[model samples]
Target chain A: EPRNCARRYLKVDFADIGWSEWIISPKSFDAYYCSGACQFPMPKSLKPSNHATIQSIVRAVGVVPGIPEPCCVPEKMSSLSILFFDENKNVVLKVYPNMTVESCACR
Target chain B: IEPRNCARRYLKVDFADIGWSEWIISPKSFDAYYCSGACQFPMPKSLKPSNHATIQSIVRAVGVVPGIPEPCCVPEKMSSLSILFFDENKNVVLKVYPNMTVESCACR
Candidate 1:
């Protein structure tokens, strides 16, 4: 059965994704993903926006066609530190913004 | 019965009432609704909360996190209002102001 919006973990390896040539450090990382349904009667705890609520209702009633149901997406994100080779072949260590999902939401 | 949950309220904005009639032209009044209400525990799906709000609600209820306050009811979506008014140079201008009217409310 489908569940409500929630965060699920995923292990990301630069080599597995074919980016190892440029990525030097941290061979793998935990990159969380959002999964689940934004079905009608969403719990307030899910923190749906007003637009998301109306969109869900419209989808449920089916009064209007082609309405898209809200999706479970990343609500909060954090940066990831990476060591990679730049265009000049120099190793660069930096923090990437919004690289890791911290939470999930229906939107 | 009065509403205790997060909801929108009726409000009318009159340019003249606020003493803006001197420069404002066209319709004297317009509906500019506002949002209000409490965001208590087990918020209904109707309120349209975000995941952060959900956790905040729980934190507030359990008193586990100090300084964390309950969600506030506010405009989650809004529309613009077109206004025809005079500028300081005495020029009649028509401009659209973004987010002038509340279209929907939510706990944030």
Candidate 2:
């Protein structure tokens, strides 16, 4: 009760973050997310012949088609039964686990 | 445009539930962490036999070792940052910022 001793303790609280797949290889890992069929790396420069740039913007909840007003994603975004891909980039492991995914109806 | 660099890309953010990784201790001795890689695991519930005999033999001699599944240190290097406060059996500790090296957490 008098002399204080040091002891080791375990972390009592922790949170679970979500997961995603970044583009680890040349080929885009994009399949059909709940939104639509998509690919990563984007083409780096879109043209009229390719509607994907606009489509990507349209597909992204942030910049949907024909919407004029600014959008807000709040703190968390809508996660779906889908996977996202980055371009030919090295996927960092620990970083992704910290990422979170939550989905809700916008409209 | 012949596609020099005008393409739009699709990046997504999702929030799902995953487990946690150990909070690696900071070099500054930020938190008065209790656990030490210096000490061995399965430490004595009561190390001092003579002094703690009553607290040990009467209280916790021939103690059953705790068994739980834990992830081992990975090849990519894992850290064992733990803290300890002397309290009976509650999450009875206040978070105090002891050392420098103020952590840069983005948000809660």
Q: Which candidate leads the pack in DockQ?
A: 1
Candidates' RMSD to native: 15.7, 29.1
What lDDT does each candidate get?
Answer: 0.67, 0.20
Q: What range of 10 consecutive residues in model 1 chain A has the weakest lDDT sum? A: A62-71
Tens digit of per-residue lDDT, candidate 2, span B1-108: 111111112222111111111232222222211110111232233221111111112112223322211111101111232333334554444333222111111111
Q: Lowest-scoring 10 consecutive residues by lDDT in candidate 1 chain B?
A: B63-72
Docking class of 1: incorrect
Top candidate when judged by lDDT against the true structure: 1
The TM-score, computed over Cα atoms with residue i paired to residue i, of candidate 1 is 0.51
- Residue pairs with backbone overlap in model 1: A46-B50, A47-B49, A47-B50, A48-B48, A48-B49, A48-B50
Model 1: lDDT to the true structure: 0.67
lDDT: worst 10-residue window of model 2 chain B: B68-77
- Model 1: DockQ vs. true structure: 0.03
